[PDB]
Design a protein around this ligand. Structure first.
Ligand SMILES: O=C1Cc2cc(Nc3ncnc(Cl)c3Cl)ccc2N1
Ligand SMILES: O=C1Cc2cc(Nc3ncnc(Cl)c3Cl)ccc2N1
Ligand SMILES: [Cl-]
Ligand SMILES: [Cl-]
Lengths: 124, 4, 124, 4
């Protein structure tokens, strides 16, 4: 086509989606990770995670307001990944890298799994 | 704005 | 903070949101523009437009499944702007620029209004 | 991935 493109548009959209999440506006699901609860937008979760994409395209699970994750999932690892979904920024630290990588593998977030593997390999 |  | 950032994350999210729109997955509103209907996600509309942000933060309008736009709004101008919301690409042409600018002014999409004004000024 |  002969379209023009606004470079900062995708980033501005994600910033506003994160502002809606922070104010709990039009969030339609709560993700339960052991004792912890995280409110989010199903569309953003699907757009970032192969696991959520599979869950919310399922004809019965698409209508659930609560999703319980596997008990082995660490709430902090989930929190860090949820923040990454809504910001593009990943808070990867020596103290959380193992939990973040395991959570990213479960959530099917291949770019996160890739950077965790590289950061671990460099420390070996 | 750019030409993509 | 000490975060790392994935450059293509915002663009990848928007691409997936557009794929969900194309397959009519988790769309929660229909925008009526005279004889034409457009299905979309309320969160994306709010993230892109000052008008939709005001409508869907309203305690009664947030629950509507149908929104009717002003009869002066051109369906093609709306279609072009809806495509821009979901892709960052604006199909701006001599034959549609007036309708696109008027629709962007109504929808409160200031970056679009700005490029339309500049493109019109250059032709004068 | 980059340092933002
Ligand atoms: O590593 C990742 C990140 C990811 C996201 C999604 N999401 C979607 N993919 C295709 N079309 C659609 Cl409509 C969506 Cl929402 C699926 C798989 C994966 N894997
Ligand atoms: O030109 C534009 C594009 C636009 C989007 C929105 N959206 C939001 N703004 C602030 N926080 C939130 Cl939560 C959202 Cl969704 C509001 C005004 C405007 N004006
Ligand atoms: Cl990822
Ligand atoms: Cl805009």
């Amino acid at each position: 086509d002969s379209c023009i493109q606004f470079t900062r548009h995708a980033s501005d959209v994600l910033l506003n989606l994160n502002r809606l999440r922070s104010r709990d506006i039009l969030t339609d699901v709560v993700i339960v990770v052991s004792r912890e609860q995280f409110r989010a937008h199903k569309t953003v979760l699907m757009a970032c995670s192969g696991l959520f994409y599979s869950i919310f395209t399922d004809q019965l699970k698409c209508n659930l307001s609560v999703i319980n994750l596997d008990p082995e999932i660490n709430p902090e690892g989930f929190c860090i990944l949820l923040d990454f979904m809504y910001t593009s920024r990943l808070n990867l630290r020596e103290g959380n890298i193992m939990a973040v990588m395991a959570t990213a593998m479960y959530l099917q977030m291949e770019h996160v799994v890739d950077t965790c593997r590289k950061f671990i390999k460099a420390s070996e | 704005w750019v030409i993509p």
